[model samples]
Target: MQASQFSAQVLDWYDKYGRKTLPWQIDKTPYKVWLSEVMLQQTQVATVIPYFERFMARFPTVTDLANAPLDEVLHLWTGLGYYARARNLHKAAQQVATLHGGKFPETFEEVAALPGVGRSTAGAILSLSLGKHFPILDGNVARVLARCYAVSGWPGKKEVENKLWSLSEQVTPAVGVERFNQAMMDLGAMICTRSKPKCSLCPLQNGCIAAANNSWALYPGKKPK
Candidate 1:
């Protein structure tokens, strides 16, 4: 399918079924988007909700987080595994406060250079919060795009990851990019799931290469044995 049509279908599906009421989606800010993206790494939405809320209540801004003690930050992040993410979160907050004057940097390079914010997380923070025209290749988005284009090979590989990143950039539209990125993520999480994806409900099913070939399990190739 054409790239424009692909994004159009996704936008339509998002309008009808996308998750709009998530905590971070409301009154969105770069800080909030960054925090949510960090919490979501290797964690489920249900698990992160309360943690996100508690963290927000305590450290509503980068300055707050930067000023708070590391012990308190880890205490707030009690159950969330990957203690490194919490430590980096504290460090990144300090970086923002010290270097950017407590304001999240607006440029992609600066944001990506943070302690734990990588390409995908940086893209998510910019597009989802600042409405920037950046593409995100998070796990959910990678699955969706891989199935849509029948992209072969495990995304862990450099070549496969590069292909997916290019596809994400090509298909991501310039206007309404924030909503489009969110829609892609929502579509992946809600329909193009890892197992037994709901193709019947998917907006891109008609144009999805894997769906047409009944090869959903094959497109996102398995990790190397």
Candidate 2:
């Protein structure tokens, strides 16, 4: 299927069935959105929920986080693993405070420069908070794209990831991309699961190449051995 068609299907599904009440979305501020995305990097939503809520309660603003000691931040993030994410969160908040006056940068370059913020997290922050058109190729999108296109290789490969990023940008719509991106993740999470994917519930099944070949499970191939 063409990129537009793929994005359209995702947007259609999003309008009808996407998650609308995720905890971070309640405020939808850049700080909260950025934090949620960072915490959710290697962690699942169920585990990150309480952490996010508690983190929010403890430091409600970028300036608040900047003012807090790194030890406190690490303490809050003790069990989340990937300690660098927390360190970078603190560093980014400080950068925001000193540079952007505690406001999250709006442009892609500026946002991407922040510690621990990469293309995917930067895109997600702008898209979700400011409704920007940037495309995110996070793990969920990577899975969906890998399966749908039968992308052949471990997604962790730089080449494979670059291809997925390009495809994500291509399929991302000109308008309502926020919801479309959300739906891409929703599809992966709610239907295109890693194990026993419910292809019947997927809107893209008819066009999904891997599903047609009954090989979606083999996809997002393991790292080269």
Candidate 3:
């Protein structure tokens, strides 16, 4: 598909069917965005929902989070697994509260520099909170794009990731991140699923390489050997 047509179609479909009530979607504040990103690293929204509500109730602000003991914070995160995200959240919260004057780092580089935050997580926080044009390529969007363009190879391999990063940045539209990120993720999770993708119902059906070649399930390549 022409990139332009593909983006338009995907965004249009996104406006209609994308999940609208995820816990993290509550507010665009950096604190909420940061909390949600950290929790979502390896967890599902359903699993994170109660955790988010309870955590927010306990520490609704960066200062609130920063003042709490690390144990107190981790106690709330006990069942979430991927414990590193919680630890990093606590560390970053303290830094933001103490050094940044309780303000989130405004630039992508600044956010990326924080503990446990990577390019994708940093991109999400920057775009979602500040409405910047940072590009994000999370697992879901990776699958969606792989299927849409029939990108080859298991993406964790260096060469495959290099190509995917190029494609991800190429397709990220400007000024629509809050909408775009959510939609991009939704496309991957719901439509371009891991197995038996809903190619016929996908908005990219018109020109998707995987759909055209009947290789939607086969395009993403095998897992690491």
Candidate 4:
């Protein structure tokens, strides 16, 4: 399918089926979005929920986080696994408070420059939290686009990521881009999963190259053993 078609179908599915009640989606401040995304990496939604709730309860705002000691931040993040993300979150909060006067950076480049934040995380923070028209290529998004476009290779590789980002930039629409971004992640997490994907129920099944060949698993190639 064309890039436009892909985005259209996904948005339609999102309206009916996407996850909208996630905790971070409720408040949607940049701080909330950034913290949620960091904890979400390499973790499940169910797992991140309690952690997110507790973290927010303690460090409610940018200033709250910035003023809190690194020991406290790391303590709150004890079980989330990725220690570096917690550290960066603290440092970035400090940066925002110290440099931006407690305001999160609004530009893509500035957001991406935060510690432990890559392009994908920055894009998500900007689009989902700030309602910017940025395209994100997080893990779920990478899986969705790879299957939709029949992109073959281990997505962890720089070359594969570049290709996926190119495709993401192409499909990302100007209007309602925030909804589209949320929908992409929902589609991958709920339907186009790593194993036992529900291809028949997918909105883009007709146009999905992986679905056509009954080889969705093959398109998103695995890492070398």
Query: Top lDDT: which candidate number?
Result: 1
TM-score of each: 0.98, 0.95, 0.94, 0.95
Give per-residue CA lDDT, model 3, range 1-225, as digits (tens).
Answer: 676676677678878887767767766776788788888878987898999999999997988998999999989999999888888888998888877888878888778888888998888887777788877888888887887777889887888887888887877778576777778877887778888888877888888888888887776777856
Q: lDDT by residue for model 1 over 1-225, one digit each (tens)?
A: 999998998888888888899999999999999999999997889999999999999997889999999999999999989999999999999999999999999889999999999999999999999899899998899999999999889998999999999999989998989899989888888889999899999999999999998899997899978
Instruction: Please give, for residues 193-218, the per-residue lDDT of candidate 2 as tens digits.
Output: 98889998888987999999999877
Clashing pairs in 1: none
Model 4: lDDT of residue 70 = 95
- Where does the lowest 10-residue lDDT sum fall in candidate 2? 177-186
Per-prediction tally of clashes: 0, 0, 0, 0
Off by over 4 Å in 3: none
Report lDDT (CA) for all predictions: 0.93, 0.88, 0.82, 0.88
Off by over 4 Å in 2: none
Model 1 ranges with Cα > 4 A deviation: none
Please state the error at residue 132 of candidate 1 in Å: 0.6
Question: Measured by C-alpha RMSD in angstroms, how accurate is candidate 1?
Answer: 0.8
Better of 1 and 3 by lDDT: 1
